[PDB]
Amino acid sequence: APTAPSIDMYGSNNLQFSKIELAMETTSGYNDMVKYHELAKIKVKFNQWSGTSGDTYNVYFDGVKVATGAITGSQTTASFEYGQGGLYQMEIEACDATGCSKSAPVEITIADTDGSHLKPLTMNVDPNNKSYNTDPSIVMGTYFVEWGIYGRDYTVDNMPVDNLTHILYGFIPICGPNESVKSVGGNSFNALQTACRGVNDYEVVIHDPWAAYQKSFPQAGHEYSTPIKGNYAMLMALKQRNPDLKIIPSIGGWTLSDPFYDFVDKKNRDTFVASVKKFLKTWKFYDGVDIDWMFPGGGGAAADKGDPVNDGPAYIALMRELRVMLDELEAETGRTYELTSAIGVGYDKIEDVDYADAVQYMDYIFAMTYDFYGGWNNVPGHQTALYCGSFMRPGQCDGGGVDENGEPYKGPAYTADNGIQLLLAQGVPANKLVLGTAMYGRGWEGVTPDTLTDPNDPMTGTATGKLKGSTAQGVWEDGVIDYKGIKSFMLGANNTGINGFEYGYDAQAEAPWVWNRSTGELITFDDHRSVLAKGNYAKSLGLAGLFSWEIDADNGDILNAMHEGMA
């Protein structure tokens, strides 16, 4: 019977260990900042200053032996490796020929990126978000944006998680050609160059490591010694609260799509696919991958890129190859991984891909049924309408008609139904299509009554420019405004219209607007009525469900209407 081991807390790093090393006080290349280990190196020191020390020690985690070795004096260091994250009751046992003596149990922490070491996240959700009993098989998705923690002041704990099945995290960049990033400003290109130092072209990185894993959030109990912080640690804690929730990294987006055009070369796809596998092993809270390429065939941020012959086949091959890779992860982990993509729904984007071929490898297509009209020009229209609006010309809807100059339309009008129908026409199953809802408006100014051909329809007018305003009103970029801003500053309590704005609805299109006759300010968006129509439409067609961009811009009204529409 030797003296029972006494744990040296200071010599054992306060029993805090981690499978991941993350730089917290510096910024450099991704591979320099992030180091993942399949096995955590555990080092525990114990003391036996009185009595006999014995010959042998045994280390137990919840009664199960994880280590053993020799005792050669009053003080002993137990060094071993362990690969499962979590919290364990550790006891250390000292043995000789006459018996064994155990230490009192103490908790050891082994951090991993599945959040297994973390307590479920405490939520701080706007109570305007209601509770629903929506069928869990129905997709209810949204995008959470990395940069939303700054000016937008929208954090992971703000998300109405119980009203979501899928959280898509925007955006993960790909190292390589990224000239489109420069349009963002705010030093975004430089930040990407820094992340990509020591990273091969066509491999993924984290754009903003401060937001991702460095920033200390007090609502998540982050402190100096916390091995993982930022959005990622909060998403890990969220997975602990909501284990059935799917959190998926979205690769690309409008400004980060440039590298995709080089996927015509399989070697570049190979590099990318391998990088994603590494990324999903490193960040275990993620449940698959979302590919947001805008767009195969061109028409995206980079005017000089797009290959209508080869992009579609590359996209299909990418999905096939990603699915093979995800199958490997499934075999290695016993988990189920999802493969998704957000796609343009303009006829001229859909036609460049055989989605029937692509979708056989995929769980969901997030149909981006918004941005049909906007401040990029001075032509008003419904940005996210289900159907063709009253403002449209004879035969414009189907595309068989003629425009103002007598020129034929080149394809069906930009509407949600036109896009969905085109996808179904390719042979895409309805139950893999997710319909897009807008949590923001697009807007113009100078659409004054004198510009209108139909005096009661501002969609028949002409603009002088983009909607302007302050970030207080949800205008983060000219021509774009948060739904919650529209509600607070244009709609008011009961859609009455405030501050010079009147409310209108196109029952043919299923699309709302607000219009200020004096300023000519006009905003197209989704509201309770239009979202109800989208939900009713989705269940009628047997679609997979609904998704939205972006949750920080909602006040609860849009996601509520999403659930009520699917009820």
Ligand X SMILES: CC(=O)N[C@@H]1[C@@H](O)[C@H](O[C@@H]2O[C@H](CO)[C@@H](O[C@@H]3O[C@H](CO)[C@@H](O[C@@H]4O[C@H](CO)[C@@H](O[C@@H]5O[C@H](CO)[C@@H](O[C@@H]6O[C@H](CO)[C@@H](O)[C@H](O)[C@H]6NC(C)=O)[C@H](O)[C@H]5NC(C)=O)[C@H](O)[C@H]4NC(C)=O)[C@H](O)[C@H]3NC(C)=O)[C@H](O)[C@H]2NC(C)=O)[C@@H](CO)O[C@H]1O
Single out the residue of 294, 339, 562, 566 in contact with ligand X (rule: CB under 6 A). Answer: 294
Residue closer to ligand X (CB basis): 57 or 355: 355
- Does 154 sit near ligand X (CB under 6 A)? no
Smallest separation (angstroms) from ligand X to the CB of 250: 6
Single out the residue of 63, 186, 218, 406 in contact with ligand X (rule: CB under 6 A). Answer: 186
- Determine how β-strand 56-61 pairs with β-strand 86-96: antiparallel
- Does 292 sit near ligand X (CB under 6 A)? yes
Single out the residue of 30, 60, 171, 272 in contact with ligand X (rule: CB under 6 A). Answer: 171
* Distance in angstroms (rounded) separating the CA atoms of residues 269 and 59: 45
Q: Are 175 and 203 in contact (CB under 8 A)?
A: yes
Residue closer to ligand X (CB basis): 57 or 169: 169
- Does 262 sit near ligand X (CB under 6 A)? no
Single out the residue of 83, 124, 150, 507 in contact with ligand X (rule: CB under 6 A). Answer: 150
- Does 254 sit near ligand X (CB under 6 A)? yes
Residues 333-372 that bind ligand X (CB under 6 A): 342, 344-346, 349, 368, 371-372
* Distance in angstroms (rounded) separating the CA atoms of residues 2 and 371: 74
* Distance in angstroms (rounded) separating the CA atoms of residues 190 and 200: 17
Half-sphere exposure (CA, 13 Å, Cβ side) for 116? 18
Residue closer to ligand X (CB basis): 54 or 381: 381
Residue type (1 letter), 358: A
Smallest separation (angstroms) from ligand X to the CB of 419: 7
* Distance in angstroms (rounded) separating the CA atoms of residues 98 and 52: 11
State whether the Cα torsion 137-139-145-146 is positive or negative: positive
- Interface size with ligand X, residues (CB under 6 A): 31
Segment lying near ligand X (by CB under 6 A), choices 87-95, 247-255, 489-497, 521-529: 247-255
**Is the preceding omega at residue 21 within 30 degrees of 0, hence cis?**
no
Segment lying near ligand X (by CB under 6 A), choices 110-118, 183-191, 427-435, 519-527: 183-191
- Does 549 sit near ligand X (CB under 6 A)? yes
- Does 485 sit near ligand X (CB under 6 A)? no
- Does 389 sit near ligand X (CB under 6 A)? no
- Does 258 sit near ligand X (CB under 6 A)? no
Closest chain position to ligand X (CB): 346
* Distance in angstroms (rounded) separating the CA atoms of residues 147 and 477: 14
Residue closer to ligand X (CB basis): 368 or 491: 368
- Does 45 sit near ligand X (CB under 6 A)? no
- Does 184 sit near ligand X (CB under 6 A)? yes
* Distance in angstroms (rounded) separating the CA atoms of residues 261 and 298: 9
- Does 477 sit near ligand X (CB under 6 A)? yes
Q: Are 498 and 457 in contact (CB under 8 A)?
A: no
What DSSP assignment string belongs to 82-127? E---EEEEEEEEEEETTEEEEPPPEEEEEE-TT-TTSPPPPP---T
First to last CA, the chain: 68
- Does 410 sit near ligand X (CB under 6 A)? no
Single out the residue of 109, 116, 255, 275 in contact with ligand X (rule: CB under 6 A). Answer: 255
- Does 132 sit near ligand X (CB under 6 A)? no
Residue in 151, 301, 167, 285 with CA at minimum distance from that of residue 228: 285
**Consecutive H or E run containing 247:** strand 246-252
- Does 434 sit near ligand X (CB under 6 A)? no
Single out the residue of 233, 314, 480, 481 in contact with ligand X (rule: CB under 6 A). Answer: 480
Residue in 276, 256, 367, 366 with CA at minimum distance from that of residue 321: 276
Single out the residue of 68, 197, 376, 379 in contact with ligand X (rule: CB under 6 A). Answer: 376
Beta bridge partners of 290: 250, 340
The residues of the shown chain that bind ligand X, judged by CB under 6 A, are 147, 150-151, 171, 184, 186, 188, 208, 253-256, 292, 294, 342, 344-346, 349, 368, 371-372, 374, 376, 414, 440, 476-477, 480, 549-550
